[PDB]
């Protein structure tokens, strides 16, 4: 239609800027990264945003609300993703044997 | 901290079905989630492989388990190589 073609345009053309993530990663490493790191790390974070919004619209469709996304559907989105191990936290030393 | 992903993330939520005009608080939650994800991946990458260096190989091992993200990384790298060859 005429909205699906505009939505497909924003699904492909949108990206995080490489001039800021290279500034963001290098503040964590200390020295330097490469261009093929920033190209991949800018691409995984678009999949991760698409992992949340496609699942936060499943929270909103499950409850009785409309397309505008309140933060109620967004804290619930991170809760359901973390219970399936999708959201990694490297500060919680987990233990499976008890 | 200011918001470094305020205008970029509003195009992306529209790209996955949200609205043309999302809420500022929802955009803020998404920006915080993206920063936390990038930080976690960078620490694990520094630990795995060459200590103190984050490489594409380390990032690929880290994302190997999740199918959607692994496929995207492989496609982007292959397309980048192809574009360099075309140039």
């Amino acid at each position: 239609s005429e909205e699906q073609l505009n939505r497909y345009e924003m699904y492909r053309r949108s990206a995080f800027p490489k001039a800021a993530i290279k500034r963001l990663i290098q503040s964590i490493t200390g020295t330097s990264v490469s261009q093929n790191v920033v190209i991949a790390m800018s691409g995984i974070s678009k999949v991760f945003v698409g992992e949340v919004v496609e699942e936060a619209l499943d929270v909103c469709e499950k409850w009785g609300e409309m397309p505008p996304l309140q933060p109620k559907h967004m804290r619930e989105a991170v809760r359901r993703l973390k219970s399936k191990g999708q959201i990694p936290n490297s500060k919680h030393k987990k233990i499976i044997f008890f | 901290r200011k918001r470094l992903f305020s205008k970029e993330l509003r195009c992306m939520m529209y790209g996955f079905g949200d609205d043309q005009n999302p809420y500022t608080e929802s955009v803020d939650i998404l920006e915080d989630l993206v920063i936390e994800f990038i930080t976690e991946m960078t620490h694990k990458a520094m630990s795995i492989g060459r200590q103190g260096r984050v490489q594409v190989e380390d990032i690929v091992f880290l994302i190997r388990k999740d199918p959607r993200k692994f496929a995207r990384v492989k496609d982007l790298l292959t397309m980048n190589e192809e574009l360099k060859r075309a140039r």
Binding site: M10, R13 | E8, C11, Q20, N21, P22, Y23, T24, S26
Partner: peptide, 26 residues
């Protein structure tokens, strides 16, 4: 020179269509 000016035109239309009014929520 063609790659340098055309890169910012994919993002310039990404500030005219999406996000016209800024909302909030209780």
């Amino acid at each position: 020179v063609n790659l340098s000016e055309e890169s910012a035109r994919i993002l310039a239309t990404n500030s005219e269509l999406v996000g016209t009014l800024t909302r909030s929520c209780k």
